[PDB]
């Protein structure tokens, strides 16, 4: 029997060489390899393969190489490849990527991917499956922000705040032992993975370190608290001792120093540079030059992504109103003009495309959109393909190279930056089963099903009173993984080694899975997957023109984007 490829892809999802459009973009991904044995594909339903004595084994107990969940026929899109496989989950972790089923009768079954009595099935045929997004620039301002993030496929929020207090509205900071404790307790009710940043400000070590011992996962240095040479230095001394990451939003005003002074304070130590382009903050006008250094892990926030015709008007005004800046005060106008620059925003699109900015993030509710990190990553990739062409490294006419470069920016790279990639950030064996299923027509726009710790937490699903789940209204809804005590097992609170050793979880009565932050201090730019470029970035102090290897980086804004008015009701 042979099956033509169109019918094969309709029934089982695409196989080797087939391509799939990402939403309504111009970007095509190609299946690189397939772990199946043609004819022994797994599938579930009436008269289907995963039935007892057939594709389901009826002999083995759960302990005996049997899965808790099998995602059948997934098109994985990951830094590690774009390929077709079954994904096996057990104890909340990804345990096998390969071919699931019953070795009694099927060829090619991965030995620990047996479908048995204990196994649940999710059909992923015709879906794209990615790792959950890792957003490392979250202001905790409004709890309604969590569902917003889940609906766009984000599964881990790193940042700070105590709700809509002014410190939290400006900065990703939960300050001090008591606010940290209080927010770790609040986290017990948030259906997403979380890590909390303390205030990376002080001139003595003890006030800063005590936040790490209290359960912070990292620190945030922000100009609004004084991004001075001393605060920078002390924070990095603490981080180096504690093995956690430090994020920085530098001194825009250049008050205590220019960029070179901030770099001298850093003194070669590892740091995550937030909104490196600078519209979101940092040394005016040249902060983006940070992204050329080997010790800098550079991220963008999302409202500048990508450069569009409404971007500058929107930002100038947002900046002016948030800072109580007056249109008739020339210092306020000069400040806005020094900070919102079409020249650095345009270059930022290209720096992403070149693998010079390694990460995306949101800046949720401070100057960024909680549910648009994934969305805007792909809009950027699409704009770049249109303006720059397929990258040289591509072949078969696919956009695989660019797709891996871009998916890395919101999955594995933030996870590496933050010291949490042993748990999350990619679809690999041994990592936590945080998985997002996408219909390709909705890819990067609205997630189908979001799996947290191996149980669905969020889904686009219909009328709960209906005979079946698909009738209208189909909307994003919290699923059983969020309910009761299951919220504890499906989510991870990331904490410093020292707070864990000191028994903070037991002291606070935390029931969530506790994740350890580690291996954050001896990484650099070279460790950012597909985005590892170091170079001399020059930003002209007079014209703001950006150069890399003596070539000016200029780009046009676009009037329309994909993943926009076709999809959204507002």
């Amino acid at each position: 029997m042979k099956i033509n490829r169109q019918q094969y892809a309709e029934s089982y999802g695409p196989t080797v060489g087939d391509q799939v459009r990402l939403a309504d973009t111009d970007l095509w991904i190609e299946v690189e390899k397939d772990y199946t044995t043609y004819g022994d594909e797994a599938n579930f339903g009436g008269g289907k393969v995963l039935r007892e004595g057939m594709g389901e084994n009826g002999t083995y107990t759960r302990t005996e190489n049997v899965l808790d969940l099998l995602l059948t026929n997934a098109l994985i899109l990951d830094y590690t490849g774009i390929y077709k496989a079954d994904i096996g989950v057990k104890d909340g972790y990804i345990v096998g990527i390969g071919k699931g089923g019953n070795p009694d009768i099927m060829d090619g079954v991965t030995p620990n991917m047996i479908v048995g009595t204990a196994t649940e099935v999710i059909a992923a045929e015709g879906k794209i499956v990615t790792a959950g997004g890792i957003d490392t620039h979250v202001h905790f301002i409004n709890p309604d922000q969590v569902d917003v993030a889940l609906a766009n496929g984000i599964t881990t929020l790193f940042g700070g705040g105590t709700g809509p207090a002014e410190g939290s509205k400006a900065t990703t900071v939960t300050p001090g032992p008591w606010n940290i404790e209080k927010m770790l307790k609040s986290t017990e009710g948030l259906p997403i993975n979380v890590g909390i940043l303390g205030k990376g400000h002080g001139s003595s070590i003890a006030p800063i370190m005590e936040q790490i011992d209290a359960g912070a996962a990292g620190l945030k240095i922000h100009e609004d608290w004084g991004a001075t040479p001393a605060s920078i230095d002390r924070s990095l001394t603490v981080a180096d001792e504690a093995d956690v990451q430090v994020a920085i939003h530098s001194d825009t005003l250049n008050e205590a120093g220019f960029l070179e002074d901030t770099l001298r304070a850093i003194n070669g130590r590892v740091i995550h540079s937030f909104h490196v382009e600078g519209a979101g903050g940092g040394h005016a006008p040249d902060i983006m030059a940070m992204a050329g250094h080997p010790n800098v892990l550079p991220s963008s926030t999302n409202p500048t992504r990508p450069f569009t015709v409404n971007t500058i008007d929107e930002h100038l005004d947002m900046l002016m109103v948030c800072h109580h800046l007056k249109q008739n005060i020339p210092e306020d106008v000069a400040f806005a003009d020094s900070r919102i620059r079409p020249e650095t925003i345009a270059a930022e699109d290209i720096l992403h495309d070149l693998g010079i900015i390694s990460m995306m993030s949101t800046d949720a509710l401070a100057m960024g959109r909680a549910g648009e990190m994934v969305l805007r990553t792909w809009q950027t990739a699409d704009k770049m393909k249109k303006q720059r062409g397929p990258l040289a490294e591509e072949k078969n006419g696919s956009d695989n190279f660019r797709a891996k470069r871009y998916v890395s920016k919101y999955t594995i790279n933030p996870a590496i930056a933050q010291g949490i990639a042993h748990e999350v950030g990619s679809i690999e064996e041994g990592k936590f089963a945080d998985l997002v299923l996408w219909e390709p027509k909705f890819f990067g726009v609205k997630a189908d099903r979001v799996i947290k710790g191996g149980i669905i937490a969020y889904a686009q699903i219909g009328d709960p009173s209906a005979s079946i789940p698909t009738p209208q209204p189909v909307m994003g809804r919290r699923m059983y993984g969020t309910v009761g005590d299951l919220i504890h097992d499906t989510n991870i609170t990331f904490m410093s080694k020292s707070s864990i050793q000191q028994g903070v979880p037991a002291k606070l009565g935390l029931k969530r899975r506790i994740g350890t932050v580690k291996n954050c201090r001896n990484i650099g730019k070279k460790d950012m997957k597909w985005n590892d470029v170091t170079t001399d970035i020059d930003i002209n102090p007079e014209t703001y023109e950006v150069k890399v290897d003596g070539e000016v980086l200029t780009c046009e804004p676009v009037k329309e984007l994909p993943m926009a008015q076709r999809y959204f009701l507002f």
Binding site: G226, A230, N254, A256, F335
Partner: protein
Amino acid sequence: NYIVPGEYRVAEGEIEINAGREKTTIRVSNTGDRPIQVGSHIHFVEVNKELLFDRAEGIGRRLNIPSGTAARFEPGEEMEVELTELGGNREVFGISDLTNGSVDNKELILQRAKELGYKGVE
């Protein structure tokens, strides 16, 4: 009689800031090629190394401007500012690490300033 909800009806008079403290006017020049904006409460001797002024005259002082406002220096701009005295214990810690103690230790402050290239140590 038109009602503006929550409106103020402020009293007569003006509010004098930093009353009773010594004021000092000095000239300051931004010798760098990027703008520098300086807040009301930063110990003035510890500002950006590229601002050129008599650094001694910034010791124990800050800008005499309303709390939470800032003075701006465009690249190449020279202008006069007015300083007032620090209060409380008159100690500064941190910021640029020039002081880390009493502001009375002028020679120590200037020595560190000079060694690190803060312009205008005279």
